[PDB]
Write an enzyme that holds these catalytic residues in place. Structure first.
Site, short mmCIF file in Angstrom:
data_model
loop_
_atom_site.label_atom_id
_atom_site.label_comp_id
_atom_site.label_asym_id
_atom_site.label_seq_id
_atom_site.Cartn_x
_atom_site.Cartn_y
_atom_site.Cartn_z
N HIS A 41 44.95 -16.71 -11.22
CA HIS A 41 44.17 -17.65 -11.81
C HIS A 41 45.25 -19.19 -11.47
O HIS A 41 44.77 -19.60 -12.52
CB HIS A 41 44.79 -17.21 -13.07
CG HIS A 41 45.79 -17.77 -14.05
ND1 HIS A 41 46.34 -16.43 -14.42
CD2 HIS A 41 46.94 -18.69 -14.34
CE1 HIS A 41 47.27 -16.27 -15.26
NE2 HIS A 41 47.50 -18.00 -14.95
N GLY A 143 54.19 -22.14 -18.74
CA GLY A 143 54.94 -22.10 -17.47
C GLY A 143 55.84 -20.80 -17.04
O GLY A 143 55.96 -20.52 -15.93
N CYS A 145 53.59 -17.93 -16.61
CA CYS A 145 53.23 -16.88 -15.66
C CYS A 145 53.46 -16.66 -14.89
O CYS A 145 53.89 -17.84 -13.98
CB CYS A 145 51.60 -17.24 -16.11
SG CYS A 145 50.76 -16.78 -17.42
#
Ligand SMILES: C#CCNC(=O)C[C@H](Cc1ccc(F)cc1)NC(=O)[C@@H](Cc1ccc(Cl)cc1Cl)NC(=O)[C@H](N)Cc1ccccc1C#N
Ligand SMILES: C#CCNC(=O)C[C@H](Cc1ccc(F)cc1)NC(=O)[C@@H](Cc1ccc(Cl)cc1Cl)NC(=O)[C@H](N)Cc1ccccc1C#N
Ligand SMILES: [Ca+2]
Ligand SMILES: [Ca+2]
Ligand code: NA
EC number: 3.4.19.12
Lengths: 301, 301
Positions: A41, A143, A145
């Site tokens: 993503h 942040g 991920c």
């Protein structure tokens, strides 16, 4: 002696963490040999994120859309591909700090260490269990991920988790390193719910053994129950049923302490029905279920 | 969101850990530039350990008595000296992985990360607070002596602890990296007792703020108390008295949540007098006191 929430030393993983940027989206990636692994993503805009078709979005990307930074030194992307929910970016440099590693999917109730990272920079390390509902109760801010979970086994890093999202309830969901989600979640910005959770019975028993090893004994009693009769009390308190397979891995702790597993189950039964009455076990006032039998043996032996 | 016991990434310290052997005694040492730091009692036999005169024992040693191993590569000792309770072994190789570092002594109630090691090999990482009685409630087995505690501050490692001993109660005692013990302990194999411990009040309040930040609110109430009136309840429950200095560092969490510190103290007062009534705060059933205001801000902001 003593018993602590204990993570694996994180250095072998710290040397693999990079920053991956696509457009205005920046998250963490995992750099092993000449491939960087990150959540797919990253290729999404905020509008794409609501209902993405990832095959479309990736087909509309080229290598020069992906800015990879290992520290300050930018890595040149020479290829890209999708592995389910993880993006693979081929780079022109093999990571010289690449450890021996494996991609392994874990089971509910198993534990791993999380190296929380932001902008490719490691910030903290902690221990997690995969909940029976396939979430983890992590500690993660915007942040994070792309942060990975791992176990270490004789200098071999077994990567088992990559962080993709926080659910509305504040628990966390992700994939294995093949990009296959843990649990019934998908990588799109929609409100998703986990199933109802349950307590990891084998782990609570492991932790009661850790307590005995460390000299906490007040919860013990002379009683015993049957494997069948205990599971009836498990159902009532939302605990997982106990298996003979579970008992057998608890074997070693049962031996080292002299407390048969079904003897300890009678202690757990009494603890469930009576509570702790203000007392603590290994510094906790509730029954901890995020230590496996392996975790206990590793720390107490 | 989420709140976890969180350690600093350990890699910068892992690259400094070595094995130091003298006679049949083997423990861990810390290799920075061309000096290895370890507990001086490595020079002791089991008989020496009962009542050692360390100046005598060291004077009877030479460089070739000290076997240092960084992994498999042996380090040649070219000098030795004593710094209070730590031994300094000069070696013929500067550690190429030496991070930027400082030797800092911490205060009771401050926290640090522990890299537990055995035979110079890092095995696990966890968080500790220095208790008000100058012990730590660590997790340490035979062979862990020489393990260090540290905080990390912008790629600078601040070493604050080296592990020397387990007390009879199973808690742990050590020195700063200048070899000065924390608390009234000495490095000899005799039964020593710590003073009575107390709860770190400022840290409990920090953690209640972490809970509010994470959406746990049930313990809040509309009440307030005075700084003076609260300390009377602190005395009764064996909590440290609260200082205006403590309130001011809690300032930021008070601002971010909108809960004045003395408002939160009334909540703590009620929690102390009434207990939790079976409910949890951030996954705990007791009042946690090993998170500083800094720890909370670092993880929640
Ligand atoms: C308690 C409480 C309130 N809970 C939240 O506010 C987190 C919210 C919950 C939500 C979920 C779905 C939805 F429709 C609306 C809201 N969820 C996020 O914000 C997700 C959005 C997202 C991005 C991509 C995908 Cl594939 C999937 C998702 Cl759902 N963003 C991250 O997870 C970021 N990368 C990392 C991140 C950002 C901000 C806060 C935490 C974290 C973490 N960890
Ligand atoms: C609960 C409980 C029971 N508690 C114990 O059995 C630990 C016992 C307690 C004791 C203390 C003093 C005494 F007279 C007799 C007994 N203490 C150790 O065994 C110490 C002995 C020691 C070595 C050197 C100095 Cl300077 C100082 C000391 Cl007191 N040994 C270590 O600390 C080792 N290096 C590391 C180690 C070994 C074994 C177990 C844990 C650890 C740790 N961590
Ligand atoms: Ca029993
Ligand atoms: Ca109040
Ligand atoms: Na930890």
């Amino acid at each position: 002696s003593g018993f602590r929430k204990m993570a694996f030393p994180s250095g072998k993983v710290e040397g693999c963490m990079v920053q991956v940027t696509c457009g205005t989206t920046t998250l963490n990636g995992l750099w092993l040999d000449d491939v960087v692994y990150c959540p797919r993503h990253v290729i999404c805009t905020s509008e794409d994120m609501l209902n993405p078709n990832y095959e479309d979005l990736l087909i509309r990307k080229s290598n020069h859309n992906f800015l990879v930074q290992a520290g300050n030194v930018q890595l040149r992307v020479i290829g890209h591909s999708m592995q389910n929910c993880v993006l693979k970016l081929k780079v022109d440099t093999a990571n010289p700090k690449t450890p021996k590693y494996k991609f392994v999917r874990i089971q509910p109730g198993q534990t791993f260490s999380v190296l929380a990272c932001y902008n490719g920079s490691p910030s903290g390390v902690y221990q997690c269990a995969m909940r029976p509902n396939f979430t983890i109760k992590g500690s993660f801010l915007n942040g994070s991920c792309g942060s990975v979970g791992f176990n270490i086994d004789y200098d071999c890093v077994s990567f088992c988790y990559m962080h993709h999202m926080e659910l509305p309830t504040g628990v966390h969901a992700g994939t294995d390193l093949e990009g296959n989600f843990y649990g019934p979640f998908v990588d799109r910005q929609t409100a998703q719910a986990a199933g109802t959770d349950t307590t990891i019975t084998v782990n609570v028993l492991a932790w009661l053994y850790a307590a005995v090893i460390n000299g906490d004994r007040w919860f013990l009693n002379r009683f015993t129950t049957t494997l069948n009769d205990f599971n009836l009390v498990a159902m009532k308190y939302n605990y997982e049923p106990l298996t003979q397979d579970h008992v057998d891995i608890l074997g070693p702790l049962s031996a080292q302490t002299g407390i048969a597993v079904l003897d300890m189950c009678a202690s757990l039964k009494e603890l469930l029905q009576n509570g702790m009455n203000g007392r603590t076990i290994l510094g906790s006032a509730l029954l901890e279920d995020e230590f496996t039998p392996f975790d206990v043996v590793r720390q107490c032996s």
